[PDB]
Amino acid sequence: SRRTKKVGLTGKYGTRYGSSLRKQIKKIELMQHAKYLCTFCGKTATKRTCVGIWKCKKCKRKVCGGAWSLTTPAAVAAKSTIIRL
Amino acid sequence: VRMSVLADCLKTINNAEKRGRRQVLIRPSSKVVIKFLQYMQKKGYIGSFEIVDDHRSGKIVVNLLGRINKCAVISPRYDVKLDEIEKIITSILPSRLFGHLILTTPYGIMDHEEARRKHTGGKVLGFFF
Amino acid sequence: GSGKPSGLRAARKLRIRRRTQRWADKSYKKSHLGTRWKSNPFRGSSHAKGIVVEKVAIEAKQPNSAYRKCVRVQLIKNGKKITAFVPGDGCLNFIDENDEVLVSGFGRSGHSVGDLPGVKFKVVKVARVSLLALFKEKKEKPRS
Amino acid sequence: KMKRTIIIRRNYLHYVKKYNRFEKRHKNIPCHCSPCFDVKEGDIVTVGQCRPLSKTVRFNVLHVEKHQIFGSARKQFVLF
Amino acid sequence: RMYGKGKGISSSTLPYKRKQPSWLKQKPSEIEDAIIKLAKKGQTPSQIGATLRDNYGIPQVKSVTGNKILRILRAQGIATTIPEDLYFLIKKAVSMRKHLEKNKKDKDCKFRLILTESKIHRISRYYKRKKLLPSNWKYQSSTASALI
Amino acid sequence: DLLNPDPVEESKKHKLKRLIPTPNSYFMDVKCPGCLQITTLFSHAQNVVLCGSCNIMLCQPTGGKCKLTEGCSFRKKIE
RNA sequence: AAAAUUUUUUGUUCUUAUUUUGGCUUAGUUACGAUUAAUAGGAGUAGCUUGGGGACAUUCGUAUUCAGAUGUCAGAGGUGAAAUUCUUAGAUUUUCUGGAGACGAACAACUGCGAAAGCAUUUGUCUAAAAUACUUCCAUUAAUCAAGAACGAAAGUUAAGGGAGUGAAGACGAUCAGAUACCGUCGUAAUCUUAACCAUAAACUAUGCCGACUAGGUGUUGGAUGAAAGUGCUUCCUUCAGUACCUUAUGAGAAAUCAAAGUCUUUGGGUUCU
RNA sequence: UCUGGUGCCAGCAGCCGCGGUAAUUCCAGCUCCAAUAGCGUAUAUUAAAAUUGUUGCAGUUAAAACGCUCGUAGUUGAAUUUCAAAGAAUCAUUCUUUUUAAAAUCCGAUUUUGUUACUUUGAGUA
RNA sequence: CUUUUGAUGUUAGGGUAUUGGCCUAACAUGGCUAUGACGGGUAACGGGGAAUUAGAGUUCGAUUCCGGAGAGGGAGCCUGA
Ligand SMILES: [Mg+2]
Ligand SMILES: [Mg+2]
Ligand SMILES: [Mg+2]
Ligand SMILES: [Mg+2]
Ligand SMILES: [Mg+2]
Ligand SMILES: [Mg+2]
Ligand SMILES: [Mg+2]
Ligand SMILES: [Mg+2]
Ligand SMILES: [Mg+2]
Ligand SMILES: [Mg+2]
Ligand SMILES: [Mg+2]
Ligand SMILES: [Mg+2]
Ligand SMILES: [Mg+2]
Ligand SMILES: [Mg+2]
Ligand SMILES: [Mg+2]
Ligand SMILES: [Mg+2]
Ligand SMILES: [Mg+2]
Ligand SMILES: [Mg+2]
Ligand SMILES: [Mg+2]
Ligand SMILES: [Mg+2]
Ligand SMILES: [Mg+2]
Ligand SMILES: [Mg+2]
Ligand SMILES: [Zn+2]
């Protein structure tokens, strides 16, 4: 059965801290705990190991990325600018 | 979409007759239209008519005699028992001495006087004054 | 087409629409509402009996000018209080402080009539004798 | 889904006098099925009345006709 | 039109004569052989008809032989497991889905994809009512990309 | 009147609006210079048609009738 | 191969053959075996086909404003008339060089595209949509739709940016009997971008959607067919699809007016909502 | 449109209204009208109401088309398979008599040849 | 919505004048529902019938006959076809 209506992941925080703070935490930690595509080996098995390091469970390559996601738009834009030139 | 060919045919005939056109064309044809036209021909309301053969549903050209007042269908084909004809004809026809209400009967298509003569009922199709 | 279904198997739709749309008629809703047994002093009767409590005079509406004579009555049946008009010329002088009177409607069952504002009742008998036979003054005298 | 017991549905049209038209209606009937037949949800069966066998059963099946449907059995309309 | 507002009436119309024209010289046998050879190269029935109209001289296949293209194709068990027009609809849907996965602000493409998938479901229901598709044929919107 | 329309007027309407629907296209024989070969072609063709002996273009697809190679002569096929 | 009867091999255990019933392999013969292709629908193919349909990136323009320079001197703004305001510590005005944010004049129309809300500088890449042409394929696959789903101007809410001009609130100066207003000088949120909500407008053609029929003329946007003036391009004719206007209706309305708001006591083509 | 009284008072009047010193409407006298051994009043209900509309309403401006599209149930869905012919009895008409494909039951004669809805005629009924 | 405490079926018994979850034991997971289940209201006993209506319809039926139920409110019991 569906065990929760709204809070989902943040049900571990109980009733503390206020509802909007828990909402922002939920938005961040959905991104932080996801799985990402490894463009080197093709499998979707890249997970965060520290605040800026991402490692693939299969080929074991380490990539420097963002804090809560593997890529950030500001770096994507700069890289695309340079590659276009 | 169409949903009927009899209603369109009768409506086109009625519209052409109000203007004195002497001839009109009916795009889709069927055996029911043929029987209805033959019955109007029998009572002297129209002239001869022609059936054109394309390799699809045919077409019809009829001759008009400036003589029809009205010809329309009753869309839901209600079924009528032999002893309910009187009420329907009282409601639908302009007089007790002329006009025709047409039924489809297990013995074919006929008006109400012939239906009474044959002791049968049926479902209603249309009428013409 | 004209906004209705006309097919040989479309009876449920027509039945249900007529059922739903009847509630917009004022007459039907007045006659079929469950609250009429509650918001009606007579409670469905045509006549009622009561005890006179107070005599009053009521103004007429704007274009007219008069002082119409009425009484205030407490019903025996349920204890409610109403206002009833006394018709005739000097007929208020036939009524004492707390007599028993029959009252009826006033002709427009739920509505006020003519010149009086907010009066829907009319006295017909006082002290077990008719008001008309008492106004004719040649027929009967008050039951002393 | 029961043991040697099935449910069948019957469809019919009801006439309304005021509007001169019809309606769709249905009623369910529990029946007994013997192991000599092999039925599935969608077939046509013929049943005959017997004495009461339980709280709800008074008919049992005598003949089966194979038939194929495409939606759920409760959504088909057949008159016979 | 089924979805938009168009009211065009462009179409082809057949001649009155149903028999083969008097100047045509082929035999039905090599016409069927041409059908089979041309389908071996990977052409759909409509493309086959167009090619026979233009590159060879054949106004209508049904006038010369007695059968239509799909029947003579099915006589040798060559017809595809998925009918043609349904296949084209699925290809369009998968292309639109890829583009949309790349661009999340393109609202028009969302509308058009909804319309195409409604069409797919309706046509699929029609084909399943006949025995042309297995009864447990579903069209999941995620596994359709690999459907060759 | 309505049963016997003037054929000059009828050849002026849309193909779907005349009493008997008839197509406007036809088939024809094309003889291009210095090729000594007769080929059947369809007016309103949609592909590019080649000569059998030498691969020379006979027509070019357009939005209506096909465009014939310059210098070629055509003749209708009767039936 | 499987069974009913004929005799049958000697009062019960005792022997054999018959025709006929249904399945089975085996090669031939038969008039042997499939309705159109809807001025219904879906798909397809073609054209240096059409469009201010959508998304992302990219490019240009004056204006305004900030800053730096530049030359000269007494006012400049603003109004019905004035005040508030700026100014010899150089205002306003002219000339040049840099940066910033929004916007896209003239062309531009009783013209184009989109389901509606909406959409207007250049170039590229994705992405759909008509319309026309067709002797291509399928063969009824369709119309309208309670529940349910997608999108939905302006304002408003949340977070991070950006922040020139305009400017709900607020503060001043005037007019007035009063003026918390109309006029004027400042000016905060907002207006713009990215990620999420909200689901409303005179969201109007105040006219639901699909199909049939009924009248003449003048235009205009996009194809196609057929003929002439041409330095395979224009003008004319015919036809399909959008889109306006004029005249008139033994047609309609209470009228205004209407090409549908007509074909309705001569009342019924299908269907949803009020 | 008769005679007296009252004078926005008293009162009447289902509705429109009457009454402020010359009231055809109040209070009375006379005279007339209606139904009549019967005639008024109150409440409910039917027709009138085509103002609940299946027969049979209305939705530009009078009350009223969802902001727009998709969509399940429901409602509604093109044309095609045996069409004819030849007599009679009838005041042109009505009623009928003959059968022109095929197969299975009488050594070229008889009759049989998908289901429902629907309509005709019967049975049974205080 | 129903089903712990019979709701829907199967097997074997008990009981009754007989069939039946009518009741008991074991076993399976069923049964109904937008074509309106489960609930609320009725100044609701059902019918043969009554009033008014051109034809459609709308409203009434405690009350001569037929069927049902009760004897201040509930539950038990004897005699007896
Ligand atoms: Mg639709
Ligand atoms: Mg077609
Ligand atoms: Mg333009
Ligand atoms: Mg901010
Ligand atoms: Mg600023
Ligand atoms: Mg300012
Ligand atoms: Mg912003
Ligand atoms: Mg609104
Ligand atoms: Mg509106
Ligand atoms: Mg009408
Ligand atoms: Mg008098
Ligand atoms: Mg009434
Ligand atoms: Mg009525
Ligand atoms: Mg009436
Ligand atoms: Mg009305
Ligand atoms: Mg609208
Ligand atoms: Mg138990
Ligand atoms: Mg009773
Ligand atoms: Mg009672
Ligand atoms: Mg009594
Ligand atoms: Mg009784
Ligand atoms: Mg008592
Ligand atoms: Zn990897």
Range of the domain at F61: 4-79
Q: Does residue E113 lie within any of the structural domains?
A: yes
Could you tell me which chain B residue has the CA closest to the CA of C10? B76
Please check whether residue A36 is in contact with residue A44, taking contact to mean a CB–CB distance below 8 angstroms: yes
How far in angstroms lies nucleotide H59's C1' from the CA of residue C2?
Answer: 11
- Residue D61 to residue D6: CA distance in whole angstroms: 9
Query: Count of domains in chain C?
Result: 1
Distance from CA of B54 to the nearest CA of E (A): 8
Q: Does residue E1 lie within any of the structural domains?
A: no
Does C8 contact B at CB distance below 8 Å? yes
- Residue E109 to residue E97: CA distance in whole angstroms: 9
Query: Count of domains in chain E?
Result: 2
DSSP-derived 3-state class of residue E101? helix
How far in angstroms lies nucleotide G148's C1' from the CA of residue C13?
Answer: 21
Q: Which chains touch E (3 or more CB pairs under 8 A)?
A: B, D, F
Q: Which nucleotides of G are covered by protein (CB under 7 A)?
A: 34, 36-47, 49, 53-58, 114-115, 126-143, 150-152, 158, 195, 208-214, 223-226, 232, 238-242, 251, 262-264, 266-274
Contacts of F1 in chain B (CB under 8 A): 23
- Residue B50 to residue B60: CA distance in whole angstroms: 6
CA distances from residue C44 to B106, C41, C74, C107, D17 in whole angstroms, order as listed: 59, 8, 17, 15, 35
Q: Please, is D28 exposed, middle or buried when counting C-beta atoms within 10 Å of its C-beta (0-12, 13-18, 19+)?
A: exposed
Please check whether residue B118 is in contact with residue B44, taking contact to mean a CB–CB distance below 8 angstroms: no
First-to-last alpha carbon distance for chain A, in angstroms, is 54
Please check whether residue E93 is in contact with residue E120, taking contact to mean a CB–CB distance below 8 angstroms: yes
Q: In 10 A of CB B2, how many CB atoms?
A: 7
Query: Count of domains in chain F?
Result: 1
Mutation target among B12, B49, B61, B63 for the F interface, most CBs of F within 10 A: B61
Q: Does residue E18 lie within any of the structural domains?
A: no
- Residue C45 to residue C104: CA distance in whole angstroms: 9
Could you tell me which chain F residue has the CA closest to the CA of B51? F3
Q: Give the H or E element holding residue A22.
A: helix A19-32
**Ligand 20: centre distance to CA C30 (Å):** 33
The reply to whether CATH 1.10.3720.10 applies to domain B69-129 is no
How far in angstroms lies nucleotide G212's C1' from the CA of residue B72?
Answer: 14
- Give the burial string for A9-48 (b: 16+ CB within 10 Å, else e): ebeeeeeeeeeeebeeebeeeeeeeeebebeeeeeeebeb
Asked if residue E145 and residue E93 are part of one domain, the reply reads: yes
Q: Which of residues 85-114 of B touch E (CB under 8 A)?
A: none
Nearest nucleotide to D20 by CA–C1' distance?
H54
Is residue E85's beta carbon less than 7 angstroms from any atom in nucleic acid strand G?
yes
Q: For E99, list phi and psi in degrees, rounded to 5.
A: -55, -45
Cβ neighbors of E82 (< 8 A, separation 6 or more) are E90, E133, E147
Asked if residue E89 and residue E125 are part of one domain, the reply reads: yes
Q: For C117, list phi and psi in degrees, rounded to 5.
A: -90, 130
Domain with residue E105: its CATH number is 1.10.287.10
Asked if residue E145 and residue E92 are part of one domain, the reply reads: yes
Give the CATH number of domain B1-68. 3.30.1370.30
Contacts of D18 in chain C (CB under 8 A): 15
Distance from CA of C5 to the nearest CA of B (A): 11
Task: Identify the residues numbered 1 to 40 in chain D whose C-beta atom is closer than 7 Å to any atom of strand I.
Answer: 1-5, 7, 11, 17-18, 24-26, 28, 30, 32
How far in angstroms lies nucleotide H93's C1' from the CA of residue B102?
Answer: 20
User: Tokens at residue D25, please?
Assistant: 């209606």
Is residue B89's beta carbon less than 7 angstroms from any atom in nucleic acid strand G?
no
- Widest CA span of chain E, in angstroms? 60
Torsional sign, CA F52, F56, F59, F61: positive
How far in angstroms lies nucleotide I51's C1' from the CA of residue C32?
Answer: 20
Range of the domain at E49: 25-79
User: Which residue's alpha carbon is at the shortest distance from the C1' of H57?
Assistant: C2
Contacts of B75 in chain C (CB under 8 A): 6
Task: Report the candidate in C84, C85, C86, C94 with the shortest Cα–Cα distance to residue C134.
Answer: C94
Q: Does residue E14 lie within any of the structural domains?
A: no
Q: For C102, list phi and psi in degrees, rounded to 5.
A: -85, 135
- Residue A41 to residue A61: CA distance in whole angstroms: 9
Distance from CA of D71 to the nearest CA of E (A): 10
Q: Does residue E99 lie within any of the structural domains?
A: yes
Please check whether residue E15 is in contact with residue F22, taking contact to mean a CB–CB distance below 8 angstroms: yes
Reported resolution, Å: 2.5
Please check whether residue F69 is in contact with residue F56, taking contact to mean a CB–CB distance below 8 angstroms: yes
Q: Which stretches of chain D sit within 8 Å of chain E by CB?
A: 70
Query: Domain residues of chain B, as ranges?
Result: 1-68, 69-129
Please check whether residue F58 is in contact with residue F50, taking contact to mean a CB–CB distance below 8 angstroms: yes
**How is A23-56 classified by DSSP, letter by letter?**
HHHHHHHHHHT--B--TTT--S-EEEEETTEEEE
CA distances from residue D19 to A50, C2, C18, C23, F50 in whole angstroms, order as listed: 76, 17, 11, 20, 71
- Residue B23 to residue B16: CA distance in whole angstroms: 8
Asked if residue E107 and residue E71 are part of one domain, the reply reads: no
**Ligand 4: centre distance to CA A15 (Å):** 30
Q: In this complex, which of D13, D19, D24 lies closest to C14 when CB atoms are compared?
A: D19
User: Tokens at residue B8, please?
Assistant: 């369109």
Q: Report the structure determination method.
A: cryo-EM
| Cβ <8 Å between C6 and B75 | yes
Cβ neighbors of B33 (< 8 A, separation 6 or more) are B5, B6, B9, B26, B60
Q: Does residue E131 lie within any of the structural domains?
A: yes
Contacts of E12 in chain F (CB under 8 A): 23
What C51-60 contacts at long range (C-beta under 8 Å, 24+ apart), as own/partner pairs, is: C51/C76, C51/C98, C51/C99, C51/C100, C51/C101, C52/C95, C52/C96, C52/C97, C52/C98, C52/C99, C52/C101, C53/C81, C53/C98, C55/C92, C55/C95, C56/C83, C58/C116, C58/C117, C58/C119, C59/C117, C60/C115, C60/C116
Range of the domain at C26: 1-144
Distance from CA of F24 to the nearest CA of B (A): 17
Is residue B72's beta carbon less than 7 angstroms from any atom in nucleic acid strand G?
yes
- Residue C51 to residue C53: CA distance in whole angstroms: 6
First-to-last alpha carbon distance for chain C, in angstroms, is 76
Asked if residue E119 and residue E88 are part of one domain, the reply reads: yes
Task: Report the candidate in B30, D40, F40, F47 with the shortest Cα–Cα distance to residue E56.
Answer: F40
Q: For B46, list phi and psi in degrees, rounded to 5.
A: -140, 170
